[PDB]
Paper text:
The translocase of the outer membrane (TOM) is the main protein-import pore of mitochondria, recognizing nascent precursors of mitochondrially targeted proteins and transferring them across the outer membrane. TOM core complexes are membrane-embedded stoichiometric complexes with two pores, each containing five subunits: Tom40, Tom22, Tom7, Tom6 and Tom5. The main component of TOM is its translocation pore, Tom40, which is closely related to the mitochondrial porins; the 19-strand β-barrel has an internal α-helix (α2) that limits the size of the pore. The small TOM subunits Tom5, Tom6 and Tom7 are membrane-embedded single α-helices that adopt characteristic shapes and interface with the outer surface of Tom40, shielding regions that are exposed to the cytosol.
A 3.3 Å resolution map and molecular model of a TOM complex from Drosophila melanogaster, obtained by single-particle electron cryomicroscopy, is presented. The core TOM complex extracted from native membranes of the D. melanogaster retina contains transgenic Tom40 co-assembled with four endogenous TOM components: Tom22, Tom5, Tom6 and Tom7. The final model contains all subunits of the core complex, comprising two copies of the 19-stranded β-barrel Tom40, two copies of the precursor receptor subunit Tom22 and two copies each of Tom5, Tom6 and Tom7. The Tom40 model is missing only the disordered N-terminal domain in the intermembrane space, while Tom22 is missing its disordered N- and C-terminal domains. The map resolution was insufficient to identify the lipid headgroups, and thus all were conservatively modeled as phosphatidyl choline (PC), as mass-spectrometric studies of the human TOM complex had indicated that most bound lipids were PC. The two β-barrels are thus mutually inclined at approximately 20°, exhibiting the characteristic chevron-like TOM architecture. Both the Drosophila and human Tom40 structures lack a C-terminal helix, terminating at the 19th stave of the barrel [Fig. 5(b)].
Author numbering:
A (entry chain C), H (entry chain D): 77 to 123
B (entry chain I), I (entry chain J): 7 to 45
C (entry chain E), J (entry chain F): 9 to 54
D (entry chain A), F (entry chain B): 55 to 344
E (entry chain G), G (entry chain H): 7 to 48
């Protein structure tokens, strides 16, 4: 049942990563995307 | 034989007036509180 | 009943007349004194 | 002495609801036209998979010769869909202190909800009375008394008594006294209310003009239900950007991006809510034109 | 103590309370740490 | 004499499917990482309400010393989700003529669809043979022969014979011959096929580099079902914008924006489909990162 | 001719045909008119 | 029945306007918005 | 009494081979067509 | 059966090995000759 326990840990850690990365894509990522794009815009404008 | 289970209903009414006097008392308390606190 | 009727009447008058009333007070003031008149076309489109 | 006016009890309970995001679903268009500084007209088109889609037409009138301040009362605002459902608000100033708000929602040709509110302002304190959803033919309806006094320049305390009568209330009449207070501590504005049933507490924390954070808890003592939220707002005029997003203690997570697209007064709003309990996600997008 | 704590987790309101007060106080800790934070600073 | 190669029968049937928009639902994130000009890796996250929502991981390999041209064959491309559903394509060149494509989709740990296709490109003509969804243990499967010859520099004509065997086919074997042609005078390109059991016609028209318009009809003589579309594409590099939108003769209307956000290689995609028969709108938005 | 044309409109395939060939030829008429059109001209 | 006939026409005029304006908001309007915004940007840049 | 309603099935097979020869014939036609058209 | 087994084996090998195969041929070529090596972090981070 070691493999099944690894399938257990895998499916759990898969789901945990899913909830984390979908949440970040909502909460943080839109800020990161526009803040990065605005920073590169300022860089290219200042370059 | 009962005309009405009024007692629970009137006790709720008694607590409603109790809420009113408590609402007034807390306003009276805070109306005194700043003097009491600065005194 | 006097109120039985008048309440339904007055609420129906509010219900249909409020946007009419807002619009009326608007066209009463009109645009600013220097601006072109508020033709109803200004309600219909930009 | 020389204390502030504390606001009003509804502004404490709303204190941290301003940064909490207001997500929407589907595609929404709004066109606003300013016909005068007294008269504005707005056309809004709502397309949604599950929200009832439709047009609604809105108009706003403000200001008369009686009222001096920049508030420019009265305010007379309402918007109606082609089906005839009306939302409208009325606001009045019986004096510079005593202020009144009225709001009514009509749908299905029926007044489904209404409230009338009175708000009075003293140098150190506020008192307000509200009546809502009245029956006109019967005693039934809702009443709320509210009181709030500044006690120290960093502290305010107050009181509230909601009341209801009639068949909507399980007891023929019910009322709930509840204390209220706010403590400023500079940035760290605490707020909350303690009821004979239920409790609510905001925490609010302005970090900077670019970042505002708050938290909530809610609790109910006869309903045995409680929730909380952690919510933040980002304001980035350097990026023509505002973002509101928060975690819900029922594990909804929401974010409502909005972009102003130019000096040309378009804004684009993107609304995402994920219900991590149901693995369900609801997207909305919409354009507002100023 | 899982025999104790699970008796909370298993019970809706007691768990709803723990969840709500937990995330709330976490927000208080985070907020008091965030007070210096800016994302695109002046 | 010395005519163009006409392409292949599938390129005629696709001729106007390139400007037809491909709408999507919900929120989709894609990250592309170029590891070398021979090796690319892409991570895609799709959050969606009714469309199946999840992650899939993609990788692409291209090019070996055997293959000279800028096509840089072979191509060896596949992407897999954590549930183990695999999509993969293989493309090979026994020479410059006799090109070969292979594709297989595996889901539920099973090959659900596959095809193998050859292209022989013969100057003035093309010949192609396809086999698809083969049973390995049984004779059953799909076969298609296709032929297309340039007849005049403005005009091409050809032929097609699809075939199927086995329990998926109502007759133990069935095949359908169908003529094919294309005509290209001026800007306009006509295309279509006349079968024993159906008809399809594209009209296609470049107005300018900024605007491309096409139309379809489809018809079936044994199924008694027919549809049509009118679809257009706008290309606006000045606006970093492309838009594909079209009316369906079943009264769906679709529009799919894509906005490249910057020289920084984000593209936003905004997808709107409204089924005016059902008054039903499906929104999608997504970000591709290059 | 509403007694005639409705007999088509009432029948799914015949109406599907009329709709599909209609919108198709409308697209042909429109396209043959659009050939000169530009949207953000050079 | 004249009023009811006007209610018939009116509800038909709802559908016609609804289908038209929702369709335009999909098909044309995204082009108009971005083309207008780009033209105003070019105007402000050239102004 | 019938062993099989084979006739419809074999007629479908006959039309399948008819489709094959027609497919070939149209290729033969187009293979001749440009000469016939320039002729 | 010889094919009864070998077909299922070979399809299982394609099913699980194709992305392994693409990745292997990728790291076989690696980066461009002047670029830093393709550490497996290249599969995981930008
Ligand atoms: C089978 C072979 C798989 C090989 C995978 C190799 C890649 C490993 C990476 C983690 C994958 C994983 O674990 O992702 C797990 C989950 C998806 O889980 P799910 O069950 O589909 O969720 C849905 C649940 N359903 C199936 C029941 C419906 O996605 C993620 O969290 C997304 C990971 C994104 C990683 C982005 C990296 C780049 C960041 C750049 C800087 C911002
Ligand atoms: C380019 C820059 C300028 C653009 C200017 C745009 C102007 C607005 C265009 C119409 C927008 C739209 O979408 O209107 C759509 C609506 C109809 O929709 P509906 O009834 O909800 O359809 C769904 C049907 N339901 C709701 C039953 C499900 O049409 C109209 O009847 C309104 C036309 C405008 C008239 C304004 C006065 C309305 C008074 C109503 C009193 C009851
Ligand atoms: C919580 C959300 C999760 C989901 C993923 C979120 C991704 C976040 C993306 C951030 C950037 C962003 O929103 O950009 C949105 C962009 C803004 O940039 P721009 O157009 O280049 O203008 C700014 C120029 N700059 C980049 C050089 C500074 O405007 C648009 O697209 C405009 C779309 C107009 C049409 C609106 C829809 C109408 C109805 C539907 C029609 C089919
Ligand atoms: C804020 C930073 C710290 C985040 C810490 C998160 C710990 C999560 C522990 C879950 C315990 C739980 O709730 O487990 C039980 C839950 C489901 O039951 P329920 O939630 O009570 O729903 C029932 C509601 N009733 C009581 C009203 C009936 O399980 C689940 O399948 C859902 C788990 C979703 C987790 C989402 C995490 C989001 C993280 C975002 C990071 C950016
Ligand atoms: C600017 C973009 C405009 C888009 C207009 C969309 C209109 C959608 C109306 C749906 C009503 C409906 O229900 O349509 C479907 C039904 C007919 O099918 P049924 O009787 O229900 O049979 C069941 C369905 N079968 C037969 C497939 C099995 O009625 C109609 O076909 C009449 C609608 C005529 C619309 C004419 C539009 C002309 C547009 C010209 C410019 C291109």
């Amino acid at each position: 049942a070691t493999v099944k326990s690894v399938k257990g840990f895998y499916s759990f850690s898969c789901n945990a990563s899913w909830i984390f990365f979908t949440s970040a894509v909502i909460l943080f990522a839109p800020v990161i995307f526009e803040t990065e794009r605005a920073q590169m815009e300022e860089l290219h404008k200042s370059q | 034989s009962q005309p009405d289970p009024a007692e629970e209903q009137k006790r709720v009414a008694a607590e409603v007036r109790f809420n009113f006097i408590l609402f007034g008392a807390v306003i009276a308390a805070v109306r005194l509180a700043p003097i009491v606190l600065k005194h | 009943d006097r109120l039985g009727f008048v309440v339904g009447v007055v609420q129906t008058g509010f219900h249909w007349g409020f946007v009419p009333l807002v619009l009326y007070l608007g066209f009463m003031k009109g645009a600013e004194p220097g601006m072109p008149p508020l033709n109803l076309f200004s309600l219909l489109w930009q | 002495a020389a204390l502030e006016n504390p606001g009003t009890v509804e502004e404490l309970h709303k204190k941290c609801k301003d940064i909490q995001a207001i997500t929407f679903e589907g595609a929404k268009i709004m066109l606003n036209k300013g016909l005068s500084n007294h008269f504005q007209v707005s056309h809004t088109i709502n397309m949604s998979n599950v929200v009832p889609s439709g047009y609604r037409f809105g108009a706003t009138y403000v200001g008369t010769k009686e009222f001096s301040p920049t508030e420019a009362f009265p305010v007379l605002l309402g918007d109606i869909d082609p089906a005839g459902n009306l939302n409208a608000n009325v606001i009045h100033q019986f004096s510079a202190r005593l202020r009144c708000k009225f709001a009514s929602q009509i749908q299905e040709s029926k007044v489904v909800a209404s409230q009338l509110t009175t708000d009075y302002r003293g140098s150190d304190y506020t008192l307000s009375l509200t009546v809502a959803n009245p029956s006109i033919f019967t005693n039934s309806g809702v009443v709320v008394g509210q009181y709030l006094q500044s006690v120290t320049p960093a502290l305010a305390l107050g009181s509230e008594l909601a009341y209801q009568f009639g068949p909507n209330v399980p007891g023929r009449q019910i009322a709930i006294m509840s204390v209220v207070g706010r403590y400023t501590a500079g940035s760290s504005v605490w707020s909350g209310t303690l009821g004979q049933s239920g409790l609510h507490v905001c925490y609010y924390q302005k970090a900077s003009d670019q970042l505002q954070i708050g938290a909530e808890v809610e609790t109910s003592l006869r309903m045995q239900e409680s929730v909380a939220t952690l919510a933040y707002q980002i304001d980035l005029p350097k990026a023509n950007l505002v973002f509101r997003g928060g975690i819900d203690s029922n594990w909804q997570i929401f974010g409502v991006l909005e972009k102003r697209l130019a000096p040309l007064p378009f804004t684009l709003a993107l609304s995402g809510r994920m219900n991590h309990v149901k693995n369900n996600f609801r997207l909305g997008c919409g354009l507002m034109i100023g | 103590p899982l025999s104790i704590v699970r008796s909370i987790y298993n019970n809706e309101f007691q768990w709803m309370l723990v969840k709500s007060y937990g995330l709330f106080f976490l927000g208080v800790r985070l907020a008091k740490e965030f007070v210096g934070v800016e994302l695109m600073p002046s």
